[PDB]
Write a protein that binds this ligand. Structure first.
Ligand code: ADP
Ligand code: MG
Ligand code: NA
Ligand code: NA
Length: 381
């Protein structure tokens, strides 16, 4: 059948298929080309993707996300212990392994991270089957370059649990480079910087590609910096505004804050292609409408430190790879946040004007390369 590429992302996942000489990135039921890596459990059902994210404020302790932060890890991992303080859902210890614990159909139930990720993968599989009209079994699934064997194995296991035949687990920066055919240029080695700014994580990778070998020279970044932080800055901005205008602090009203957050995320996306964005929320709080706007300049100002700060891991990656800026053949934009004009300007300026590879939607580039690899491994390329 058709082999697919799946980017199983920390915040958003994406599925592509290579057929008839090109990659098609597949839209979900709602027409979205990426799907939130969310699973929710209710009195009646299990929800995955858009439907799960959509009900988070009304069911926060039974709505699971960030499974990628747990997958392949032990409960007593410092990372797991630290991350747990920022999740509304329970994480419990089963004989050393972390499990998310939720209420579901009126009973208490627990799931391993790879079970939760299996559900997201099931959804991605179903998305592909809905479009293709065919059973989808074979897949290439991607992971961050720094993932160890426990994390890779658990990611593969998530696929197996979802009934996927995982052809290979490949690195996200490798998938991005494959998408751009940077392994197929007429020449010897190519030094490639992958600048991946996603929803919750920032990954910089330097690869040296030669003879079909994607040597990881260095990785850097911030596992807790992404688009969510920019949204947070916007949310705080508007909470303060509403307090001034109406003498109401909406902060502890989970539904109101969530609706504001959704509006902010949308506005952010709009600001990547327009110089201003409208915020339009009926009855944000006590029936009070919240209709206003934000300029691209104000968004950039709110986030100025965070945007500039992405360059520090780039310098670090270069130093650790023992390469000058000028030795980089290709710069590749990955992750939805790299659509931000200010981020692109900062990075291009940092490379003293060098053109960026960004023709492939950055939030789709990983899935794109995974789809190409899947075709190669299934003999369809
Ligand atoms: N046009 C855009 N402009 C700015 N941010 C965007 C845009 N499109 C998506 N994003 C942001 O990208 C982030 C998701 O990145 P993505 O790479 O899809 O996920 P992940 O990091 O989970 O792989 C979210 O914070 C989302 O708001
Ligand atoms: Mg990603
Ligand atoms: Na993604
Ligand atoms: Na990332």
């Amino acid at each position: 059948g058709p082999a697919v590429g799946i980017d199983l992302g920390t915040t958003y996942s994406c599925v592509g298929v290579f057929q008839h000489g090109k990659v098609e990135i597949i839209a979900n039921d709602q027409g979205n080309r990426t799907t939130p890596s969310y699973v929710a459990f209710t009195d009646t059902e299990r929800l995955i993707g858009d439907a799960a994210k959509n009900q988070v404020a009304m069911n926060p302790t039974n709505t699971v996300f960030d499974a990628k932060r747990l997958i392949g890890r032990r409960f007593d991992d410092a990372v797991v212990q630290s991350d747990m303080k920022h999740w509304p859902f329970m994480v419990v210890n089963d004989a050393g392994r972390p499990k998310v614990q939720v209420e579901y159909k009126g009973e208490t139930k627990s799931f391993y991270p790879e079970e939760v990720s299996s559900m997201v993968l099931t959804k991605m599989k179903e998305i592909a089957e809905a479009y293709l009209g065919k059973t989808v079994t074979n897949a290439v699934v991607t992971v961050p370059a720094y993932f160890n064997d426990s994390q890779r194995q658990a990611t593969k296991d998530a696929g197996t649990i979802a009934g996927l035949n995982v052809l290979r687990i490949i690195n996200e920066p490798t998938a991005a480079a494959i998408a751009y055919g940077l392994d197929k240029k007429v020449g010897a080695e190519r030094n490639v910087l992958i600048f991946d700014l996603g929803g919750g994580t920032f990954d910089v990778s330097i690869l040296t590609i030669e003879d079909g070998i994607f040597e990881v020279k260095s990785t850097a970044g911030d596992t807790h910096l992404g688009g969510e932080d920019f949204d947070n800055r916007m949310v705080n901005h508007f909470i303060a505004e509403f307090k001034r205008k109406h003498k109401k602090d909406i902060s502890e009203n989970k539904r109101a804050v969530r609706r504001l957050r959704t509006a902010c995320e949308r506005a952010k996306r709009t600001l990547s292609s327009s110089t201003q964005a409208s915020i339009e929320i009926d009855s944000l709080y006590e029936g009070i409408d919240f209709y206003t706007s934000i300029t691209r300049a104000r968004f950039e100002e709110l986030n100025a430190d965070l945007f500039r700060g992405t360059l520090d891991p780039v310098e670090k990656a270069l130093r650790d790879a023992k390469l000058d800026k000028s030795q980089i053949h290709d710069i590749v934009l990955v992750g939805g946040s790299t659509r931000i004009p200010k981020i692109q300007k900062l990075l291009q300026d940092f490379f003293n004007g060098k053109e960026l590879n960004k023709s492939i939607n950055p939030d789709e580039a990983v899935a794109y390369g995974a789809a190409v690899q899947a075709a190669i491994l299934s003999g369809d390329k």
